[PDB]
C-alpha cells in the first residue's frame, strides 16, 4: 500500500469515477442523501404541523389527505422561531413531527450540500484542466434557495416564514410575500423576470438560429441529428450564415458573429438577472420593499385619483387581511 490515506485521497479525487465524488463531495453525498431521504418520507407520511405556533396543525403529506399538487413538507413552528430544533431537542419524535422538525433537518442539509455541489462544480473543472466559473453560474440558483430558505427566515425572525417544500405551499409563499412586500413593484424582482423571460427568449434564439443553420450531411428521410459525430474537429453549423440571417432580421451591428461573445452573453444575462432576484428576496427580508405609490396622484382639491398602483393595493389588502386568519392579535403586522 503506497499508503492507505495517500490512496484514499487518490480515489476520492480520482477523475476516473463514473460520478466524481470530490472533496466537497464527501460532505455533499451524505447531507444530500439525508435531505432527500427525510423529505420523501415526510412528504409521504409525515403528520400535521403547527406551522404558525397557534396549535392549528396543517397536514401536508400524501397519506394525510394531500395530493402531489397540494402536498408539501411544512415549515418548523413559529413557536420555535429561529431556534435550532434537531431531533435530539425533542422529548419524542411525535413532538418533533408536530413542531415541524423535519423541515429544518431538510433545509439545512440541502442548503449545505447544494453549496458543496457548487464547490464540486469547481473541483472537477480543476482536475480536468478546464476554466472555472461554471460553478459561478450555479451561484445564482443556489443564492436563491438560500434567500428563500434561510435569509428570508433569518430576516423575518422565524423559519416558519421560509418557503414551504411543496407546490401549493410555494404559491402560498408567493401570494403572501406580495401582500407584505409588494414585490412586483420592486426593481430587483423585475430584473429577475427580465433575466428569466430573457433567458427563455435567448435560449430560443440561440437554439433556433444554430439549429436552422446546420450544414447538410443527412438524408431527406434521416434524422438531421445524425449529421454530427461526438468528437468532431470542425463545427456543425454555419455561424456565418446564422449571423447573416440574424443581422438582416434586425440590423448587422445588432447581431453576434463571435461565438465566444455570444455564449458569454447567453450565460451572463440570466445569471445576472437571477442574482438580482435573489438579492430582492434577501433584501425584502429586512423589509425594504417595493415602490409604494399609494395615493400619489391627487387632484386639484385633494381628492385621491387612483392609478393601477392603487388597484394593486386592494388586491394586496385582500391577501393581507385574510392570510393567517387566527394568528394575529394586534393592529400592525410586524412579523
Amino acid at each position: 500500500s503506497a499508503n492507505l490515506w495517500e490512496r484514499f485521497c487518490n480515489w476520492v479525487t480520482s477523475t476516473d469515477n463514473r460520478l466524481y465524488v470530490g472533496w466537497f463531495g464527501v460532505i455533499m453525498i451524505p447531507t444530500l442523501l439525508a435531505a432527500t431521504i427525510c423529505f420523501v418520507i415526510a412528504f409521504i407520511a409525515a403528520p400535521p404541523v403547527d406551522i404558525d405556533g397557534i396549535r392549528e396543525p396543517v397536514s401536508g403529506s400524501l397519506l394525510y389527505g394531500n395530493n402531489i399538487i397540494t402536498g408539501a413538507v411544512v415549515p418548523s413552528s413559529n413557536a420555535i422561531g429561529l431556534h435550532f430544533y434537531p431531533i435530539w431537542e425533542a422529548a419524542s419524535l411525535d413532538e418533533w413531527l408536530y413542531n415541524g422538525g423535519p423541515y429544518q433537518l431538510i433545509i439545512f442539509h440541502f442548503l449545505l450540500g447544494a453549496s458543496c455541489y457548487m464547490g464540486r462544480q469547481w473541483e472537477l473543472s480543476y482536475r480536468l484542466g478546464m476554466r472555472p466559473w461554471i460553478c459561478v453560474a450555479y451561484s445564482a440558483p443556489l443564492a436563491s434557495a438560500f434567500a428563500v430558505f434561510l435569509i428570508y427566515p433569518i430576516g423575518q425572525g422565524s423559519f416558519s416564514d421560509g418557503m414551504p417544500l411543496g407546490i401549493s405551499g410555494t404559491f402560498n409563499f408567493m401570494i403572501v410575500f406580495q401582500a407584505e412586500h409588494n414585490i412586483l413593484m420592486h426593481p430587483f424582482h423585475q430584473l429577475g423576470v427580465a433575466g428569466v423571460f430573457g433567458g427563455a427568449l435567448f435560449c430560443a434564439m440561440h437554439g433556433s438560429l444554430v439549429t436552422s443553420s446546420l450544414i447538410r450531411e443527412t438524408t431527406e428521410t434521416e434524422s438531421a441529428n445524425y449529421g454530427y459525430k461526438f468528437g468532431q474537429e470542425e463545427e456543425t453549423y454555419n455561424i456565418v450564415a446564422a449571423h447573416g440571417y440574424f443581422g438582416r432580421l434586425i440590423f448587422q451591428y445588432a447581431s453576434f458573429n463571435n461565438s465566444r461573445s455570444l455564449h458569454f452573453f447567453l450565460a451572463a444575462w440570466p445569471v445576472v438577472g437571477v442574482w438580482f432576484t435573489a438579492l430582492g428576496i434577501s433584501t425584502m427580508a429586512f423589509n425594504l420593499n417595493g415602490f409604494n405609490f399609494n395615493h400619489s396622484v391627487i387632484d386639484a382639491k385633494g381628492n385621491v385619483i387612483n392609478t393601477w398602483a392603487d388597484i394593486i393595493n386592494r388586491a394586496n389588502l385582500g391577501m393581507e387581511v385574510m392570510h393567517e386568519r387566527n394568528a394575529h392579535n394586534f393592529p400592525l403586522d410586524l412579523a
Binding site: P270, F293, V321
Partner: protein, 341 residues
C-alpha cells in the same frame, strides 16, 4: 423585368435595415403600435374608462403609467376611430380607450409581419426557418392573452392593459379569480421558461469555461475564428464534466441546440392553452375531494385550503375599484378578514 420584379428588386435590396415585402406590413404596424403606446403612456387618460390616472401628463411614473382597456360598455367593439362609438372624433376615441384596440390590433399584425419577415429573410439568405417556428410561441401568448382571453369574457375591459403595474394587477387578478398558479398548463409554462432560462445560462457557462486556448491573452474573446474551422470549445471535455457531476450530459450539439428551441417554445405553448381555457372560465380552481373533506371536517388543513382563502380576500377587497361598471358596495361587515388585521 416588370414593375413587380422591379418593385421586388428594390425591396429585397440589402440595406442597413432590410425592408422586404414583409416590411410593407411590419413597419407600418410595428411603428404604430409602439407609437400609440408611447403616446397614451404620456398623454391619454383612463378616467372615463377605469376612473384611473394613467399618463405622465396626469402624474404617473414609468411604473404606474399605461394604455388602459376600453369601458366594459364597449363590449368587444373594435372601437374604430370612425366607428359608431368615437364617430370620427379623435379626442373622444382617446377617452373611450380607442387607443387600446389600436395598439392591440396593430401590434397583432406587426407580429404577423415580423414572423413573415423571418420567413422571407430566411429564404433569401438560404437558411432553415427554425427562427420562425420558434416565434410561434410568442405569437400564441399574445394572441391567447390579449385577444382570445377577453374575447371569452364580457369585453376588452378584462384583457391586460398595456403598462407595467397595469399588468401586475392582471397577475394578481388571475390568482385571485382563476387560481391560475394551480393550473397544470401554467406550471408547464413556467417549467419551460424557468427551465429555458437554465439551459441558456448553463450552456453559456459550459462553453466559456470549456474553451481551447487560441490566443496568448487572458481576455480570450479576441481568440475567436469568425471563420469556422475547429470547434472553439472542447465538446468532448464538456461531456465528461457533466457526465461526472450531474450524471447525465449532452454529446450531440445538434440535439443540445434543438432541445434549447423546444423547451421554452413548448412551455409558452402550454401556458397559452391554459389561458385559452380561462377565457371560458374553465379554470383549474379547486380539487373536489379536498373541498368535500374540508366541509365535513373542520380540522383538515392543507396549504391549498389556505390559498383559496387568500383568493377570497383578493376578490372581496379588489372587485370594487377593479370592476367599476358593477357599482359594487360591500359593507364593512361583509368583508372577509382574519383576527386583528
Amino acid at each position: 423585368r416588370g414593375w413587380f420584379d422591379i418593385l421586388d428588386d428594390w425591396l429585397k435590396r440589402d440595406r442597413f435595415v432590410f425592408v422586404g415585402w414583409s416590411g410593407i406590413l411590419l413597419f407600418p404596424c410595428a411603428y404604430l403600435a409602439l407609437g400609440g403606446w408611447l403616446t397614451g403612456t404620456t398623454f391619454v387618460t383612463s378616467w372615463y374608462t377605469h376612473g384611473l390616472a394613467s399618463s405622465y401628463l396626469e402624474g404617473c411614473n414609468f411604473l404606474t403609467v399605461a394604455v388602459s382597456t376600453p369601458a366594459n360598455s364597449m363590449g368587444h367593439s373594435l372601437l374604430l376611430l370612425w366607428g359608431p362609438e368615437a364617430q370620427g372624433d379623435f379626442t373622444r376615441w382617446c377617452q373611450l380607450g380607442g387607443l387600446w384596440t389600436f395598439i392591440a390590433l396593430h401590434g397583432a399584425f406587426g407580429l404577423i409581419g415580423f414572423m413573415l419577415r423571418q420567413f422571407e429573410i430566411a429564404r433569401l439568405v438560404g437558411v432553415r426557418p427554425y427562427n420562425a417556428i420558434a416565434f410561434s410561441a410568442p405569437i400564441a401568448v399574445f394572441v391567447s392573452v390579449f385577444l382570445i382571453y377577453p374575447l371569452g369574457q364580457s369585453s376588452w375591459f378584462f384583457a391586460p392593459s398595456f403598462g407595467v403595474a397595469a399588468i401586475f394587477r392582471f397577475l394578481l387578478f388571475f390568482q385571485g379569480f382563476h387560481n391560475w398558479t394551480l393550473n397544470p398548463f401554467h406550471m408547464m409554462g413556467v417549467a419551460g421558461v424557468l427551465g429555458g432560462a437554465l439551459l441558456c445560462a448553463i450552456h453559456g457557462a459550459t462553453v466559456e469555461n470549456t474553451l481551447f486556448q487560441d490566443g496568448e491573452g487572458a481576455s480570450t474573446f479576441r481568440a475567436f475564428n469568425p471563420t469556422q474551422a475547429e470547434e472553439t470549445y472542447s465538446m468532448v471535455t464538456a461531456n465528461r464534466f457533466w457526465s461526472q457531476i450531474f450524471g447525465i450530459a449532452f454529446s450531440n450539439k445538434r440535439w443540445l441546440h434543438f432541445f434549447m428551441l423546444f423547451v421554452p417554445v413548448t412551455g409558452l405553448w402550454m401556458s397559452a392553452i391554459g389561458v385559452v381555457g380561462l377565457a371560458l372560465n374553465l379554470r383549474s380552481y379547486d380539487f373536489i375531494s379536498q373541498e368535500i373533506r374540508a366541509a365535513e371536517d373542520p380540522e383538515f388543513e392543507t396549504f391549498y385550503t389556505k390559498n383559496l382563502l387568500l383568493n377570497e380576500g383578493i376578490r372581496a377587497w379588489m372587485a370594487p375599484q377593479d370592476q367599476p361598471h358593477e357599482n359594487f358596495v360591500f359593507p364593512e361587515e361583509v368583508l372577509p378578514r382574519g383576527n386583528a388585521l
